[PDB]
Amino acid sequence: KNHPMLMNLLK
Amino acid sequence: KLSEEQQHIIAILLDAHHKTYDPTYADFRDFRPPVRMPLSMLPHLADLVSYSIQKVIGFAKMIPGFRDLTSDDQIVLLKSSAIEVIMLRSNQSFTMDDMSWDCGSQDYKYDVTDVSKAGHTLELIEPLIKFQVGLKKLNLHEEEHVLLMAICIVSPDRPGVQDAKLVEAIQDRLSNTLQTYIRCRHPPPGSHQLYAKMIQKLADLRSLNEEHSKQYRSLSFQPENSMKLTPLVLEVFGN
Numbered sequence: 001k002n003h004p005m006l007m008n009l010l011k
Numbered sequence: 012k013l014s015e016e017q018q019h020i021i022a023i024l025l026d027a028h029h030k031t032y033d034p035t036y037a038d039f040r041d042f043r044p045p046v047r048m049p050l051s052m053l054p055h056l057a058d059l060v061s062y063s064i065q066k067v068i069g070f071a072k073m074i075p076g077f078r079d080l081t082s083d084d085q086i087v088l089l090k091s092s093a094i095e096v097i098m099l100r101s102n103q104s105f106t107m108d109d110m111s112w113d114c115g116s117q118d119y120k121y122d123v124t125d126v127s128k129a130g131h132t133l134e135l136i137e138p139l140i141k142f143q144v145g146l147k148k149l150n151l152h153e154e155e156h157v158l159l160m161a162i163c164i165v166s167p168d169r170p171g172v173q174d175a176k177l178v179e180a181i182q183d184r185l186s187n188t189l190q191t192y193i194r195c196r197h198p199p200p201g202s203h204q205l206y207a208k209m210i211q212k213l214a215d216l217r218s219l220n221e222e223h224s225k226q227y228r229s230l231s232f233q234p235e236n237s238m239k240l241t242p243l244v245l246e247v248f249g250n
């Protein structure tokens with residue numbers, strides 16, 4: 001993670 | 012009795028759900044269209060799930076205490092819970108009349124054969140429908156439904172969790188709020204063992220999650236199926 005989209009949607 | 016804090020929590024979760032669940036389903040028009048003549052329903056349901064992952068993230072962010080978590084812990088909680096929360100939230104469109112998810116029109120009404128046309132077998136789908144049926148039979152208050160979604164997300168035992176103690180504390184606050192809500196606001200006989208029943212549904216969701224994961228690993232192993240997915244789905248669910 002390695003989780004740009006998730007991290008971006010989270011704030 | 013329900014503390015002021017506890018009623019606050021409830022208000023926040025209701026609002027957060029209202030902000031992330033559009034019971035008109037108007038956004039479904041934006042999805043790749045459903046096709047029902049193999050895997051003809053995969054683009055449409057891949058899009059549905061992708062949309063739903065976004066909404067579940069927006070709900071999670073508003074859970075009191077969730078922000079105090081690390082970024083890593085927020086990430087692992089969402090990754091492991093997303094499918095389970097979509098299954099939970101899906102119950103609101105679900106209808107016992109024909110055992111289908113009815114999202115406002117015939118095009119967006121999904122039955123067992125549709126799910127089947129997204130690459131999944133009865134080994135997932137049958138327990139998923141029974142889960143939908145047992146949840147519906149609980150006849151939860153909306154307040155109970157939103158609490159259960161939040162307690163599902165903030166689970167200390169999820170793979171990858173770092174600060175278990177902190178996740179535990181957030182969830183206990185919500186568990187206590189739920190327990191007290193049932194006692195103060197949910198009359199008997201519907202209240203009978205309702206907390207234990209609601210916690211059993213969370214165990215059902217762990218099992219559903221595992222099965223979905225294995226059928227996802229199979230489906231997505233083939234690159235021509237993986238292609239029909241979305242980038243968010245690949246990221247959150249794996250590849």
Ligand SMILES: C=C1[C@H](O)CC(=C/C=C2\CCC[C@]3(C)[C@@H]([C@H](C)CCCC(C)(C)O)CC[C@@H]23)C[C@H]1O
Binds near residue numbers: 060063103129131
């Ligand atoms: C807005 C919503 C919810 O977020 C999701 C809704 C329905 C959910 C469904 C109905 C069809 C089958 C669904 C999508 C299940 C199915 C197994 C997901 C498959 C995902 C895939 C990537 C193809 O593996 C999970 C949840 C089920 C409609 C509506 O209630």
